[PDB]
Amino acid sequence: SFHVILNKSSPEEQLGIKLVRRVDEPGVFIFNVLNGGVADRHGQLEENDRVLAINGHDLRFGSPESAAHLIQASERRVHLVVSRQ
């Protein structure tokens, strides 16, 4: 896995990532990265990347809804632990 740090300019700012679950395997996955958003401008994240944790909260067997809640909860810093096939 690897580390990605994204910073929100305001607490309600979205990262511009759509997350999905899959019927056939556990995990929270990147469906797409919105053009011009925080994640796109940072540049590292790719579609199909798996989000393993956000700010130290485990998402290996978690849900996109939990991910959204955790991303919102941070005032600014969003530390993602990510894996890529």
Binding site: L15, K18, L19, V20, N32, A67, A68, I71
Partner: peptide, 4 residues
């Protein structure tokens, strides 16, 4: 999908 869930937007974050």
């Amino acid at each position: 999908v869930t937007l974050v």
